Amino acid sequence: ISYKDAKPGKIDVNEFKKAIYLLIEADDFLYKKAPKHELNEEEAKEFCKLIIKCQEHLNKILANFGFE
Amino acid sequence: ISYKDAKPGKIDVNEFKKAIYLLIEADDFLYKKAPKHELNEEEAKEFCKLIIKCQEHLNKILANFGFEFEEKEIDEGALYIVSNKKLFKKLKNKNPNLKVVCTEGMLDIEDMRAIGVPEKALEGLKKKVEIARKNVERFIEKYKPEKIFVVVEDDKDELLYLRAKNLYNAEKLDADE
Amino acid sequence: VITLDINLDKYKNLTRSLTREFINLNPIQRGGILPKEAKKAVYEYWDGYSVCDEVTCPPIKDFLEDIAKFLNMDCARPTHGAREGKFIVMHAICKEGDYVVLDKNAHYTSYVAAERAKLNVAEVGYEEEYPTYKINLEGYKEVIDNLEDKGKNVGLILLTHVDGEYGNLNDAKKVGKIAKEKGIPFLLNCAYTVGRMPVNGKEVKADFIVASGHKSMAASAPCGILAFSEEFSDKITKTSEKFPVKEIEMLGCTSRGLPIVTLMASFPHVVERVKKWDEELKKTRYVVDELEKIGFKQLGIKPKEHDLIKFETPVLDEIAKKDKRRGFFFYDELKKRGIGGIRAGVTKEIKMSVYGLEWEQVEYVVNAIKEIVESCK
Amino acid sequence: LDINLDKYKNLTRSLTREFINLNPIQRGGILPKEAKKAVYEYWDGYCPPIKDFLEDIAKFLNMDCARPTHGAREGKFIVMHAICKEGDYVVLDKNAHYTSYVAAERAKLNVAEVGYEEEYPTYKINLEGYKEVIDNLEDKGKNVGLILLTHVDGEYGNLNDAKKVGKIAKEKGIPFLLNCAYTVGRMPVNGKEVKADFIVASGHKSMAASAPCGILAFSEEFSDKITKTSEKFPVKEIEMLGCTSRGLPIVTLMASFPHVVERVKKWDEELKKTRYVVDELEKIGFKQLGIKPKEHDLIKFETPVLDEIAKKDKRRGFFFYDELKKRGIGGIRAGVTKEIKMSVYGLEWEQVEYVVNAIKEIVESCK
RNA sequence: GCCGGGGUAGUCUAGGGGCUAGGCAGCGGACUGCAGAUCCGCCUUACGUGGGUUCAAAUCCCACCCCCGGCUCCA
């Protein structure tokens, strides 16, 4: 995957919105787990769930620019 | 890749901040290209570059929770010439025993004349220019690689590319970053 | 599971709006768009106070001196906007009952702040009303003398540097020179100028300058700047007696949180964009020259030396009276094409600005309006 | 203009996320994620949602009317300016916030202090002493314009029975302003139960909003003088200067409001955190100042053991700041060892333990 | 936290955009065992970290971290 392959396309606004909302939701962990930010298994699953779902929204965005 | 497979680990906050900043930068496109948000080829490259660099940072975060990512690909035998040593440094941390050299600027000197400002600062650069062109040898001379790539991070590097392999063959860019 | 006594989920209709789905043409909005540098700063500084410890690093001290040089004034103080800056000088310089002499194009907050400072107000009139509505700056002398001859005192001279109805620029130096030899303090309302075009306070011989962060310095509301000469420092920065450090007109406030952070963050972007003020005028004049072709008459001084445009738009009346949407039609036709910022129901006039827009967005807006008035007979 | 702009390009480095902040003034201003999303929607700008919000605040505080402000101190000055005649006396407690004195002086009013039921170590206010101070002033011919109680002070974090002062003010015919900074948004508040005529609140101190915002709640009785309008612009309220509240602080305030309504119902849990910190730190020789037990999260400690360490450490009094910094804890003033103030409001219980164990390990390793 | 000094390879000290710093109880090899000179490489990615400027940064810019001195007892 290279950005140089990017093709003309439309930005899916809502899909972008969902992506950044998820990182906002994940931002909580940076507060609640400060200062050492060490997560346990339950916290890890809850947190990474947010990160991964963000990446799926980002991929859908990249889909509209010729990426698959 | 499933979240259920996530394992105990530490959040890299600096990696998380780089990720969220990249989306914040990308948010400008939702303003500047409103209402239709249609992007042309150059805008698409610039925008997707942000999204993709963000997804990479997210992947480094996920790596701390057991998830694994296959880390580009690099031939560790080849020699890699580079102008910056920020690029040099970056190469040596992604892979330490990986062998690279720093020319510290443009190499040839009417190559240097191609960028500008005259000029017996140049034959003042007499040693330097060739000091890069000496030292490149001191690496190639004894390890001497199969083939020798030159990494390109902007257009003035490809000029260094041309001179380097007037002399010794092979090009690269971005594919290992 | 809500704690029901009253509705609470109507509050998460805040969660998604239409802020990125539209071009906003509202002139009070154009100069307050946040650059990415400031948005990043917001992410770092959401929460409550931002006080690591009023001489702060968080470089507020350094920012206040830099914003002073930028305006070529002796001193500066952070405010909750241009409103508060006016009220502060009206409250700490004038004595109650004094007269404030201001132009007839003055922003309503100049009137309201005067009433709050229990001051009287006299208006300097037009050099010409319709259609330019240009202020007679020389008329400041006659009003003052008119008032001094009647035993009334004039505590403050005020000039709206660019009014918010027509967007007319004014030669501040002239009112400054009148104020100098007539020995009356001069406040230049640089809401709508500071952060768009360059402004030299000393050259216009201004004693005070108020700036609006959210209007014209790409910052979040509410913030602003009050700049002033060393001569009036003692009264502006007058301290509480029980608390020797806290300044009374500030309410001692560590002028707090998010807006001042965005103001410091947007500052380099602002400094660079006033050097390019001519490019925004070019966008502005392109709009005026182009919409006149379909029957929009630019009001105010021609040509525009500011981005705020007020058009007389008879053709929009002509269409409103024949369409079922009946005056809402223009607002609905704009939203349908992803444009807002114009008041619904109004067709006799419109106010707009394309300040800060990309040139592609400028063309889009212009073509949009043309196709509206074309398609709608 | 020959100035280096590089200083403003990396403000991207406030350390709220990599440090635990124990500073009381900031504990209740931490944004929930619902507010952060709202900020993303309104970085720049967007009023019926505001008017409905004010109606809700009025009910939530059980008051007739409410108006948005740039903070608690602005709310104070608004009342003093619109209600009191110049020269009047405001009567307030000796634990009053400096902004109360300053707002009074700005409204060119006079100030009389109600004193202490007891000083060391609780520094409690003699609330019935309000009748005395009022009497003594009225007997001297001075008129009292305003009665002011700081519901919870910002020095010791004492809670005060506002209803007692309310009844006093009711039977001497004097308007009562309750300074509910440090209180509204933390604990439930019933304004008319305490018979308050006015309530000020700090959005950014105790209502999980971005600075600067606040609330001024008032009775229908004084609505005409508070919401009085300009003669030239009858729609515009003079004391508000026409505002027209826009920008992020009022957005965060509204977006955080359901979270705030929720968290006052769980105020006891935060007290439980607070009392846990007191009991534990007293074992290492800290002494809690103020009324006991805590009925607010703001703790002031007398810390003799810290000061004794300071006299033998090369870093002197700043040793404690460093040691906390090494373990990711801040919000306590540098160099001060005779006293410290702190709150663990809103922290996770795990973070509360971490703070306590860190402090214990400080004093033990540093003798 | 504030004001100064500082951080350069196993540590020692220079240099203030480009001249590939140089000296050791540090370790191998250049006959053997004792003692001194050279070639070397050696942990090699030398410049506390992350950004920025530049064709090029130890060097200039911003921010942050650690070591040494010092100074403060609430608004």
Numbering used by the authors:
A (entry chain E): 34 to 101
B (entry chain F): 34 to 210
C (entry chain J): 13 to 65, 73 to 396
D (entry chain I): 16 to 61, 76 to 396
Question: What do the study's own words say?
Answer:
In the present study, the structures of the binary complex of SepRS and SepCysE, and the ternary complex of SepCysE, SepCysS, and tRNACys from Methanocaldococcus jannaschii have been solved.
A crystal structure of the SepCysE-SepCysS-tRNACys ternary complex was determined at a resolution of 2.6 Å by a molecular replacement method. From one of the NTDs of the SepCysE dimer, a linker chain (residues 102–110) extended to the C-terminal domain of SepCysE [SepCysE(CTD), residues 111–213] to which tRNACys was bound with its CCA terminus in contact with SepCysS. The SepCysE(CTD) of the second subunit was not visible in the crystal, probably because of the absence of bound tRNACys. SepCysE(CTD) was bound to the elbow region of tRNACys mainly via van der Waals and ionic interactions. Since most of the interactions of SepCysE(CTD) with tRNACys are with the phosphate backbone, SepCysE(CTD) is likely to be a non-specific tRNA binding domain. PLP was covalently bound to the side chain of the conserved Lys234 located deep in the cleft at the dimer interface. Second, a helix-loop-helix-loop region (Pro333–Glu368) at the tip of the small domain held the acceptor stem of tRNACys via hydrogen bonds and electrostatic interactions. The ternary complex SepCysE-SepCysS-tRNACys solved in the present work presents the structure of which the 3′-end moiety of tRNACys is at the active site for the second reaction, while SepRS-tRNA complex solved previously shows the structure for the first reaction.
